[PDB]
Amino acid sequence: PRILVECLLPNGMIVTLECLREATLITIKHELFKEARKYPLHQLLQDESSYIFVSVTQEAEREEFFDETRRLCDLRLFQPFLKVIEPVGNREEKILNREIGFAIGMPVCEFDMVKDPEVQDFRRNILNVCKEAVDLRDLNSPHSRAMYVYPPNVESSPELPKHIYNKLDKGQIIVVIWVIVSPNNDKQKYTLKINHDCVPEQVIAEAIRKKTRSMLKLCVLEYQGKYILKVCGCDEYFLEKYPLSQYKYIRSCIMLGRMPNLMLMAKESLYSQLPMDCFTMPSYSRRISTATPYMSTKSLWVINSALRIKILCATYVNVNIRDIDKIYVRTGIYHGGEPLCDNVNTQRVPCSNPRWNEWLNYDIYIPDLPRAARLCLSICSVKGRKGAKEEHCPLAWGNINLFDYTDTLVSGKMALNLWPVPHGLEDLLNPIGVTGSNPNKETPCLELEFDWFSSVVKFPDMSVIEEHANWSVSRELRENDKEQLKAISTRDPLSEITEQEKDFLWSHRHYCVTIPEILPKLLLSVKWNSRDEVAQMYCLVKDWPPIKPEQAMELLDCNYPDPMVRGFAVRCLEKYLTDDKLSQYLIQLVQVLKYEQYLDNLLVRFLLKKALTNQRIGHFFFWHLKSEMHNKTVSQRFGLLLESYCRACGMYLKHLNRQVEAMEKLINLTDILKQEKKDETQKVQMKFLVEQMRRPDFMDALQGFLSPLNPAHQLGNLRLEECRIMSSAKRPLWLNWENPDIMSELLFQNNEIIFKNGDDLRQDMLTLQIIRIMENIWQNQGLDLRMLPYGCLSIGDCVGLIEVVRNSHTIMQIQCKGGLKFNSHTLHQWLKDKNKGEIYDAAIDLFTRSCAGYCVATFILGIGDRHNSNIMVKDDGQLFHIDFGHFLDHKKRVPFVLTQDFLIVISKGAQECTKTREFERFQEMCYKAYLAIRQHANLFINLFSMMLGSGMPELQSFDDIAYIRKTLALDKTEQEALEYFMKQMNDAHHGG
Template sequence: MAPRPSSGELWGLHLMPPRILVDCCLPNGILVSLECLREAPLTSIKQQLFSEARKYPLYHLLQEESCYIFVGVTQEAEREEFYDETRRLCDLRLFHPILKVIEPLGNREEKILNREIGFAIGMPICEFELVKDPEVQDFRRNILSVCREAVEEREGGGAHTQALYVYPPNVESSAELPQHIYSKLDKGASASQLSLCLKCSVTHRWNEWLSYDIYLTDVPRSARLCLSICSVKGRKGAKEEHCPLAWGNINLFDYKDTLVSGKVALGLWPVPHGLEDLLNPIGVSGSNPNKVSMRAVCLCCRHYCVNIPESLPKLLLSVKWNSRDEVSQIYCLLKDWPLMQPESALELLDCNFPDPMVREFALRCLIQGLTDDKLSQYLLQLVQVLKYEMYLDNPLARFLIKKALTNQRIGHFFFWHLKSEMHNKTVSRRFGLLLEAFCRACGMYLKHLNRQVEAMDKLVNLTDTLKQEKKDETQKVRQKMLLNTYRHESAQAYLYTYRMLLQTNFSVFLCLRLEECRIMSSAKRPLWLNWENPDIMSELLFTNNEIIFKNGDDLRQDMLTLQIIKIMENIWQNQGLDLRMLPYGCLSIGDCVGLIEVVKNSHTIMQIQCKGGLKGALQFNSNTLHHWIRDKNKGEAYDRAIDLFTRSCAGYCVATFILGIGDRHNSNIMVKENGQLFHIDFGHFLDHKKKKFGYKRERVPFVLTQDFLIVISKGVQECTKTKEFERFQEMCYKAYLAIRQHASLFINLFSLLLGCGMPELQSFDDIAYLRKTLALEKNQQEALEYFTKQMNDAHHGGWTTKMDWIFHTIRHMPNEH
């Protein structure tokens, strides 16, 4: 039986054996078998090989050792030349332990660079060179000129600009609150024509013309032909069931603005799980379609709309894009249209606006008003909307890669946002080309990226091995043996002097503290990793840094939720409301692989309650949390801790309610020793809450139990009658109304990620939950009354939350750390 595919050190094996027999093919035709250590570098193997070759015939035909390199076949079925002879045998990812000795041909430096780039992006560069599509080759050539301009800008200013590139200041660029217009929330129908063109027989073939009632001169520049193949199942008289099989899209105009003609071979894509709406790929889009009368009003008032720049999305959704006259009028308006705020212009980059002129205008707004810190804040969405671009070479791609090459912090996350999507075949070519251009121009930083990629690959191999272990009495012994493998000095070379992916301060190098690392108890076997900071000034920053490495969980929803919480915090701070949120670091780096920052000196509510004995663990004593905070903070620190708890609790109550965060048991809420509360694990949002026998387990809009109210009221049992509780309510009301004023921003940010494939963000019906919680159909007073009712339901129904916590504690108390 053929060995199973593996991402490990050898085909079929996550970890290579300590000693392995390697077959080496010499240029003189002699085959030499060597017993090598898995951690042996290629230099050592070459010396051992040539020493052994002296014992074989035809040795005199060989040249000096330095004249040769090794070549092998990797697990991707690619022939790779190994120029870097410091690499270890276990790092080569060979298909089979066979190495061939050859004389290198061609440009050595170029081949080394191509190998490093291919390793960083996860696919060999030669795949791009074999693509015959002229758009790919033109893009590779043209994007390099953009990279060259960015590098000249980065290095042209001398030490000052280079320092700003490596150490970009992490400060707020402006203290002014942007002016937002709220009348653009409603979206309309996209210009599309959907009709049944023909019925296919069981022969699965047809050859006829498709006729559309549109003149060729009226075909919009952004038009595309969308095909969807589906099966129909149903008996006579019964309702037919449609099952999507595959889909594909063709741009009617190519990247040179030429109408596509002739025969086109279109490879279809499989339908993603749960996306049945792909049966109608060009159907109505938007959360609130425009009515015909509203469209007519917008078009009639288009010249007046110029005075309201943020009304542009509303106007564009009213345009008949299959009418040349209307499109030409809009193009004339765009030339004189005032620039919009960057947050408003983001909406013009989603799938509802494919027209190149519109997207180019949106990018001008971003270039004019988007600072580097704001760009970092919205980078997740901007990378994802690259999927909506019609062509490889587009203004947004040029803008992002230029920013990535002039700001190392942006470049770092730009690389990993693209890298994490490389498993998605629908975008791997587009993102791979961008990664290639970035890696060619990022200079010495490429080596650091490769160290990070290598470290992540090794950790994936380790967790894959751990997940296969059986739960028996020898499990801990075997896991300890596996960790001991990584204690060897050469084996952990990829983890030492390793730049932390979650840190924004890239100047700090960290060393792994193996004695503090452990394997967590959950089924995915996440790793708790602890790095120390060897800097002599580390006591002023941090002496160590802890992260959780997860392999098997999709962290994109966590990453999005934490991003939204961070934006909420910025909005509150700009309005003078400091709610002390704690959006810890989280980064998805691959297919269900990612990193989570561990917050120092923090404990789960369950851990704290268990310290209060059986009564605390079983929710009979609601004073345990307050007693714990009081014991950790003496004197004046106690008042500061209560104030910190009150502020952070108010912030998370509002945030979790608006976003519909679910699964809020007492292991997903944590408190720092200084009193700061925060939530973790955002695997369920937008009201996709867990159900039991068809009923939602969580029956309150957000968590506000008696435990929290006692802390807020400083231990008073009649919590709701205290001034502290009134102050807490006032904070919640102000926070809710502040976010409601920026509702369009949050709806836009979620809309831009509809194409990500997140399991709980796949349609506008999911985003409609935000409109509900923000009460956008009500005026401000009605919205405040609505939120007040939700808050009353939360603390009056707190007993239901505590019941859920009891069952969770009983089930998980032995495994809680």
């Protein structure tokens, strides 16, 4: 409020002015210039129109503050200093660029000053995708902009599930239209009648012809183009000519039995609600990359030599000479995780002088390098004194692409920084790490020298590979091999594939065009360290029939780094994958974006194009990559993608920045809640947070911003009375926000959010995602094991958001409620007390089915000890698990032992819970759920294998995924897996 800010006037004379905390630039600049005129040397001073403030932010970059409307606290200045200087630049570009930098947390001029040419070529080529996306965005403006800003929430299924088709009155849905048509905002009910096959045009026609009752051709047509359907209380809009059974609100209402809540909002009101978005070309796009190096050359297929790489020295290995004697730089030519040749090692030099100068030769010849070759430098040292036995341990690792964006072999002496060892890395190298030097300078750096040809050598275009494909072939089945191929196709991605079967696969490739499933196994059956084999496989992939997206995503994790294979997979994705299941699998594609060896390829183009044409997909894309700015291994690439998205996402930027700054400010709260407050029973136990949210500068930053967990949900006025903290896991935040719109009372009058710090909410998101795909499978195969994947979103380093479902209580909650107002019959009695009557047994049925949802789930995913606090039951009889965290093995069995209270509740409170009639029905639907998962377990292996390079401390390589492979029993047959589960569900009660 009294900050003494000094300003650098461009005449030279020095002024210092008091400034308020909430004061903006225009409020302080007027008296700044006034008392500057009062102070001497008022000669070069003139009006404020041609004078612009310049300062350096706390992210260490000077940036002009053209936007005069911004406050002092929004400046984020390391020192209270300003400068007054001529603009010498663009207005809108600089406000846009600062807003982009605030959305990332680091500015665009950091991208400007980095001299890696691949980064700037990426920044040039992303604007092609941006301009195509904004051209298709406004191709049918404002109609197409309506579907962009508020996306349809449709699935890819034109039909409907069979077991919910019988949940309605012969395919008919009773809705209520809450249309107002009133200057005095009077709300009213239109209970109204539709089938499911028709699109919303017949629905709005019926609403027109039924609205016109009690006061009675072209009128229906003109109201059709002026009315639109909106979900009450939440911002979903029914826009596109779709059969209306795919809208997730309607299907969720079918799930829960609640009637849908809709209305007829004016189309022009929605059009005026969404602002017109602007897309301007960047300043760096003025530069054209047309280089003429006055100094086309020969290719790889004319130069015949071996791969020779010379190691010069390390800058400084960060070791201790007292207990460590000798060090070495054992390398490896990798293709993802597969060594293309032997791991050629250096000499065992002492750590005192880390100098090698060793010309390591490799078994691979130069023409036989694959496109995605990855050298893996590793400083690892023998730190064990044993006789004829050396103990090895990694210290530094670093991957290097042998080909760049120019698609040429690396050459010449070059230094490169090395990443520190990951936590608990089993391998001595790092197969899964990304290629690139460490951005930090205080890490060990090492020198390389490739075979300097005194020229450039270029990997050829596909014409040469196409000709070599016809060349190498010159150099009607027995059905047993066909059924063998069918057997190979059904195997999981982690199948024990053999070279008998690999040689069978490679020797019969043109006969594998009949079945498309065999492709990823044929990925593993080829020798990438070959000349003819890679050409043959490229020729096959160029003519290979398209793939279902669920196993077209198989070609995307770390084991498949080939640009052509990943390009074909991305082509199959954009040809087949739909928006709802793209947003379903969006976390996995975000984590696949790490595995790209380059910056600009087809995957990033596809994900950007789908992100810049969809507010939901783009919003979740932005939040997923924003959650990983703390990961410096892919911070540059993901920061470039936040830069591109924030360039071409439109006015959501503002809303985005608001929630971002809200989250950032909220994150700051937890800092004072964690570092300053780490004790108990003080004067400021609860009063401090009440006073802090009573501060206008904090509470005003949490007003009117969209929910980060769902763009359709919007968050409004905060209730400080209904905000508190817990003492359950690590003191998270209970946050209550009233839904701003008037019709909020239909769905929920208040939105509750858990804000969690202290645990990584990234594996929890993955677990809840698994839960949602098992929901999809069980609904598709005809079993309504209704288990809820509550929304969870990580937003950075060990920080997350959880949306709260209400009317829920723990076992501890109901136990202490019963004790105050313990026995093994309290859960069943409480469920009697909540919903008795003719619905009660149905609720019990739900409680059985959701149990059959979770128990099997908690065995397949291997969740930890599910005690009485990390589980909650609803009022309508539905349980769900919350504290997932440690998943798969995570401690190296028997997860989620069926407790007694379950045996009371599923068995209707009978004393003999063992052989009730509903118990074998429970077991039968558990069996059916597991089998339905089991023929779809290939997708689960894919989805967990596309998460290896993420960075959870409990999912790194093929040491953890064997847990779900052994619980799902892909090695065993179906009946062996069945008896496996009769074993575990017989020892669940230790005898029953």
